[PDB]
Design a binder for this molecule. Structure first.
Ligand SMILES: Nc1nc2c(ncn2[C@@H]2O[C@H](CO)[C@@H](O)[C@H]2OP(=O)(O)O)c(=O)[nH]1
Ligand SMILES: [Ca+2]
Length: 104
């Protein structure tokens, strides 16, 4: 069980796909939701080793299973590129400061 584990949140590949589709849709229409304007470009400061090509975009994936629509983001995120490919799943949980750690 769990294709991705961010902290204690367990996500299946289906949860990730759904979250990605919603994030990508907004990106291609040029729209954003939430105070931090999601989805927004992800600069990958930490140099995560994503295999897919940049640019990258940060989009919240909620543990409640709902698609993000502007409320509180939480700590988990799906990163995808303009080719609509999954770059990876990361979280703020377990990281210090304003950094991320990859979900296992
Ligand atoms: N932690 C972090 N924030 C990022 C990254 N890429 C983009 N951001 C967010 O997007 C802005 C533009 O690069 C940054 O100031 C940062 O704002 P936040 O800390 O407000 O999320 C990244 O790799 N790591
Ligand atoms: Ca952020």
């Amino acid at each position: 069980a769990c294709d991705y584990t961010c902290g204690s949140n367990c996500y299946s590949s289906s949860d990730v796909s759904t979250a990605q589709a919603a994030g990508y849709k907004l990106h291609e229409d040029g729209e954003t939701v939430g105070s931090n304007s999601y989805p927004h470009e992800f600069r990958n400061w930490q140099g995560f080793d994503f295999s897919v090509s940049s640019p990258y975009y940060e989009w919240p994936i909620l543990s409640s299973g709902d698609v993000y629509s502007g409320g509180s983001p939480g700590a988990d995120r799906v990163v995808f590129n303009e080719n609509n490919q999954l770059a990876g799943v990361i979280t703020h949980t377990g990281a210090s400061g304003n950094n991320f750690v990859e979900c296992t």
